[PDB]
Swiss-Prot record:
This is a cyclic peptide. Disulfide bonds join C4-C20, C8-C22, C13-C27. This is Cyclotide hyen-D. InterPro entries: Cyclotide (IPR005535), Cyclotide_bracelet_CS (IPR012323), Cyclotide_sf (IPR036146). PROSITE patterns: CYCLOTIDE, CYCLOTIDE_BRACELET. It comes from Pigea enneasperma.
Length: 30
């Protein structure tokens, strides 16, 4: 539910490394 400070319009969430995921073009975790 909290933003990881990264977007994923065209690239992946490199913050997936800390458990984030792409949710409607913005990287979030919990």
């Amino acid at each position: 539910g909290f933003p990881c400070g990264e977007s994923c319009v065209y690239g992946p969430c490199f913050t997936a490394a800390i458990g984030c995921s792409c949710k409607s073009k913005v990287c979030y975790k919990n």
